[PDB]
Design a protein around this ligand. Sequence first.
Ligand SMILES: Nc1ncnc2c1ncn2[C@@H]1O[C@H](COP(=O)(O)OP(=O)(O)OP(O)(O)=S)[C@@H](O)[C@H]1O
Ligand SMILES: Nc1ncnc2c1ncn2[C@@H]1O[C@H](COP(=O)(O)OP(=O)(O)O)[C@@H](O)[C@H]1O
Ligand SMILES: [K+]
Ligand SMILES: [K+]
Ligand SMILES: [Mg+2]
Ligand SMILES: [Mg+2]
Lengths: 316, 145, 607, 607
Amino acid sequence: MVVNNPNNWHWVDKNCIGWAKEYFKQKLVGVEAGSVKDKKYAKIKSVSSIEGDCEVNQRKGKVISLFDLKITVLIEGHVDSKDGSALPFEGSINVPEVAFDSEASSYQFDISIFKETSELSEAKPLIRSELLPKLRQIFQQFGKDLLATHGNDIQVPESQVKSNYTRGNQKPQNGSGNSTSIYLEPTFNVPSSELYETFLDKQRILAWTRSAQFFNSGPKLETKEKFELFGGNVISELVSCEKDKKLVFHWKLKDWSAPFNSTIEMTFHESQEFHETKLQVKWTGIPVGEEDRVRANFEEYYVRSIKLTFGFGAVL
Amino acid sequence: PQNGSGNSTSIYLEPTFNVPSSELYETFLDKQRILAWTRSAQFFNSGPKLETKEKFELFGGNVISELVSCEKDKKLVFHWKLKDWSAPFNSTIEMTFHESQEFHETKLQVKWTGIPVGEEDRVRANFEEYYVRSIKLTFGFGAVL
Amino acid sequence: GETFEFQAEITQLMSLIINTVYSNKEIFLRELISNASDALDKIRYQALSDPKQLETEPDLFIRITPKPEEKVLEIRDSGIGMTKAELINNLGTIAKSGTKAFMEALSAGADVSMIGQFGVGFYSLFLVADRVQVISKNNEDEQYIWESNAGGSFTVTLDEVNERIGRGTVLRLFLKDDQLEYLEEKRIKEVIKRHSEFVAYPIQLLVTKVQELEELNKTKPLWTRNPSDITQEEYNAFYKSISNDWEDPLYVKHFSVEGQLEFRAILFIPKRAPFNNIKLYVRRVFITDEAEDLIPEWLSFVKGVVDSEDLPLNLSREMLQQNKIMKVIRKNIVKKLIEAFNEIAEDSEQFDKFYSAFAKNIKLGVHEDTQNRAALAKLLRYNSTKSVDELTSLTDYVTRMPEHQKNIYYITGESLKAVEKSPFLDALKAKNFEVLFLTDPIDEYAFTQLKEFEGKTLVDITKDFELEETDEEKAEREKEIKEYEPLTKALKDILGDQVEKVVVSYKLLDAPAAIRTGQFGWSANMERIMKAQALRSKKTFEISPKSPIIKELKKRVDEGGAQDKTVKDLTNLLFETALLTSGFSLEEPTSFASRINRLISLGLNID
Amino acid sequence: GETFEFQAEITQLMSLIINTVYSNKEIFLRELISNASDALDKIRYQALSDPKQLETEPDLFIRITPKPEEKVLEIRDSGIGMTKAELINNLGTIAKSGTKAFMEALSAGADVSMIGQFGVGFYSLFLVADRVQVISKNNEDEQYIWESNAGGSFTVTLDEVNERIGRGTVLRLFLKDDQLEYLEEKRIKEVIKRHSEFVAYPIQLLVTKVQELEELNKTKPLWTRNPSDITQEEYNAFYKSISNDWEDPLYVKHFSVEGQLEFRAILFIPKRAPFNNIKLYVRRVFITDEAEDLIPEWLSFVKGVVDSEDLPLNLSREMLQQNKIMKVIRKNIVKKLIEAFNEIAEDSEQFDKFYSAFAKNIKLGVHEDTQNRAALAKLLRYNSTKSVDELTSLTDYVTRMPEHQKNIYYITGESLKAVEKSPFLDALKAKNFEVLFLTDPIDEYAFTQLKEFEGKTLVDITKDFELEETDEEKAEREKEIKEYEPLTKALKDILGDQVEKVVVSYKLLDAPAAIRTGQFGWSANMERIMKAQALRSKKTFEISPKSPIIKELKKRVDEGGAQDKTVKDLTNLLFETALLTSGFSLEEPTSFASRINRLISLGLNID
Ligand SMILES: Nc1ncnc2c1ncn2[C@@H]1O[C@H](COP(=O)(O)OP(=O)(O)OP(O)(O)=S)[C@@H](O)[C@H]1O
Ligand SMILES: Nc1ncnc2c1ncn2[C@@H]1O[C@H](COP(=O)(O)OP(=O)(O)O)[C@@H](O)[C@H]1O
Ligand SMILES: [K+]
Ligand SMILES: [K+]
Ligand SMILES: [Mg+2]
Ligand SMILES: [Mg+2]
């Protein structure tokens, strides 16, 4: 790109989070450990998510990168079996952080094998034998290729730089828009039995909302039933619901137009080990310029309002 | 022009405490009570309470104070000096009590003189932390929010 | 001595206005939309004197067309446009503002308020673009092209290859490789909603569904209109635009101050507490909302915006410099909101929802603010023995005060049921004295700072206090206290340091004993509050000489039962029982339960 | 077609650089001292190669002489000075930085840390001065005078009416009528103690007592030195300079990161909580202290400063760009502080003062921070049944856990005396199970987020939980629960909706009954905490089958006493008594006190 920095003295930043994702999608995949003919085998098939920061900066001619990415990938393969042929399995590898000054022994790997059992004990030493050393050399080489590819995009060539200091440091009609979708997982300290009736019992709904207008005389919410919340500004309709497992609502704001109507999908993931419940909310149909508004208010009128009225978790 | 030090200044505060003047006067003199709201006090004499012309170090020895004049629940004059201050600088803090029987309060008019020019804002903010709010939270002589 | 002139290093000054002139990079869109609104104001001012100027392109709009295939962000406006000379002087000279030069050439008393005053706002687009292709078209000139690559030179070429436009200016922003986020529908609507959401002219966005045009600024600003012509529905829609709240505003306070500090401000009071909130606008442009001296801390719940005009902005137009003027707007906001709160108090239904939702905020101002402490005390509402059903104010309290009452009596506690059945009310109810009820933890913090209301001193009945008494009772009480002197000395020796003193009190009727603070220390509720805060006194033993239990204990003392085992057990039992009624917490509650268990066994004939 | 060059409007650029760049007007002193330090670095760099350049003025000082009678603030430095051409090229041209050009002339790897890089910092003095009379003197030139008044022109005249100086530059500032505050001693020392405190060269100030010279920068920077050569007394004086605290720092953490990101930081842990704090310095000059992405909120108690010599600075040089460098420094500061906290944990006398003073801050990290939640969990220190003397850690807890224990048992409450005598400890003490004691209100907020320590699940004994016993005991307990089934049904009908269910529990040995939560909701202590905050659950009736009182109540049920008046009185008595032991708030204590007064009257033979 065109960078107007005489002698490369000012801080010019160039974000590379997009190229970083494309880099690992061409380097992490296809990496296998062992062989297909062998009794144990593992190979990465795809990258789950790449979140963090990846940016290159220059101050006085030195290409500086302070990237920090949390990489998660999915792996497949098979292990040895006592009876019959080999048994396939699936897993995932979680890396805490990939910094710029990380050493070979600094990279950590959280082993997450699906369907754990006693027969898959040789799954962890398998990836730690050949798969992990292959991931270490890629992460160490990621910093070198990043400075060599995007480093030349900044720091204009020395033929135009008259500074020996910085040189020594270089090496249609009117309508509306489309919709979108968000995903959040608020944690509640309440079993799915009481949390399910919280969104259905009209007596309990009025508690954490303090404003509701039910059109039917039913005790609790039923399928294909409309009701207005917050002075009639929030219009929701229960169209599908499972027993303490699924909740589907047709959320709609009064400010929205007619061709816009969102859908909330709530899934219960109560875990008796810690006595809590993770309510995975798959919210789709929100307008593009409205996803941040409904998400910030959902953590105020739905998440915190229930945890403070009924006490389903302490917040501070 | 030679190498020396600057001039001095003076401040004035009126922290309101919910405590009778009799109990608040004993707070700044009783060594057992001083160690409570100060958390660090070093007394050199075996006396139970503070007397005139008696030096004592507070807050690990960084604050050197000395009672030079005091009246019965009416006046408290101390010579206040910090450890990082130079030798010529030596501040004098006066405490005047005003007990109000209508509101059950005591306005402690503090007339503090002899403070260095650069050390003006430092001794004022920390006074509300180590002297005003410390006593209100240790003995319950005032609501702090 | 020779007199030279100041120069400018173009090769280095441009870098100062391209690299480090804007903390954030999304500012380029705001300063380009603001430049488009200024051009629309110029052609609108000329249309009033010459209708032929607005005949080429009569529709005034601001169109944004993102192109992800070739990485071009097109921003088209139908303003006055720029000639060939204006592209060299107004768009080719640093710190040269043609808009400000147009404002100084207007007439006296103009109704147009343009934004461009500095002259370096156009160079913001280079933060995200490497080269810009400006296509301008004026009425008195041809269509030209202004191309530059953020360096030290630019090219002005006659337009002969692009589409012919009627009037205005088209900006083609070739975005960089890392700044491709501004080609999406999300980032475009995010910057406009944050910065240029209140543009007087409609902002059109070309969204790919087939492609359509959507107006980003749907809610027109209301601060440029009279508050009498604005209806209630317009205030509700305006509140849902300045804030992400879903509910309608409870009260709207729209005022206008004139003179040397002409500024508009529409302040909204929500129905629910948001637990900044007041945004600042200059020339219909959002500057910042991080002003901490504009609104007090206890008053930070009020929503709305403040559109001022005489504010010294920096080169980035996103923060304010110290000018000692924000304190003037601060006191005007508080003065209008206090006046607005008094208007809410005129109605019963409106103030009931306001007080129940912001009880902590109003009482916090009495503790924090001092200049308007008396005005905030007028809004304080609490329950009492004569107002158990509804809420009453402090003024209505003094109205119902008898002639022989000189102090406002109140009591604090945890809940309403605890203070309503408190044994401290029996004394004041006999004298026909109303006692307020304090249920919120912040109540005591407000009463400890007010200290007086209309000459009446605030006195807590939980602490030690003195009431009026007749001459016949004054002499009778002194005789009875002297007779019960050995009983008080016996209870003092049993409890030890648990109480400060044991005295005979006549302010108790049914309860045989009670505990008071001492009118100088922290109350039983205040001590419980401080010992229960997540982010963070002596006792007086008073007995009732008319209770049958106390009279039985008096008979034991005269018979030599000062050191009896049964007397000491009932003494510690009655003392810890009074702590539950006075609001104190029992230390080691297991020992207190053991005394109750032995009483139940005694009642069940257990040996 | 036509290619032009970017120009600049000098008559308007001067007003923008001076008035609409810096937020405060005191910033002018920071740049003039920084330019004085840069000139001193230039002559010092030449003294190493030519000692004759330092013979005209060997003392490298910065002298400030205010004149209230003449309204003149003189700032004299002994730097390299400026020649006749430098006063016109460097000082006369806007954005022209000769200091930056001097840094570009030398080779990469020098020991120069000059400050001037932009070239518009000199014009800041016009915010407070009407006209300037800067006098310069160089070794290879004569003494000249640079006069200007920000009017678009300056004058360079040979000096013949001023005192002859050896080498340096004298800055004569004719302050305005409204900016005369910079002529006193308080304002000058305030700006120096805020922006130019850690200048390597001594800053002299001419104060009027006879007039003397006082060195304002008495504490030299310690980050320019190795942490091994610095003693303990130097860290104490350095802490008293960065902050206004009087006491010595409890712990010092001095580290330095050398590599792609070169920044040094000296972090101090105070002895008392200050209830920002970490200042940022670039080129040994204060930039800002209100950074939010530098240090977390729960960790903001740590004092100190951070030297970040190379950073993207703003045009005003008091704010950082959106460059993602703050997050890199954020994780390094937390990593070094957690490592520092572990070094404090190695000691016994020092960690006692640290934990007792910052108990809330450490536990807030477990509640807020998630990436470093396991590292902070090992620093938590509480009391237990086996550690009543001193505080024990979670690691030492697992070490003393028997082989048949699989969960970490704890209990929260109001104070330590209440949790040590709670009836919930009798079950765990029989099985030799250690139970932690939680006395702070923030303790529950931390345990509700960790949920696991080294595979051990955190279980609160206050809530309903299940213990592991043999199969033979489960058989005999099921018979006793089935036998006491009508007893539990009788207690449920009397209390009504006060409890969720009445079950026979074997976790009680001496107490007759207790109250537990339903494993979901707010605990007994948590519910009391939330209902007592100023700025802001169903119950289970468990009875003990081995208590004599419960056995007597069982005999009454078999005799038809399910609706007896005496049974219902003792039923509500045991329930309201168990609420006091379990930590619940008692409703309407007057009714509970009336039951005690009737029991005392019964014991005193009162009919
Ligand atoms: N879209 C446009 N259409 C017509 N004229 C324009 C347009 N953009 C800029 N100009 C002209 O260019 C001049 C310089 O604009 P800018 O460089 O943005 O500075 P400014 O807008 O005058 O002041 P600021 O810095 O934005 S407050 C304006 O005064 C207009 O005369
Ligand atoms: N007191 C001084 N003595 C000698 N030279 C100076 C002094 N002050 C400024 N200069 C020179 O004048 C030029 C203008 O400085 P300035 O505009 O402040 O740039 P910067 O802010 O980058 O230092 C600088 O290049 C510097 O070298
Ligand atoms: K311009
Ligand atoms: K300059
Ligand atoms: Mg602009
Ligand atoms: Mg400078």
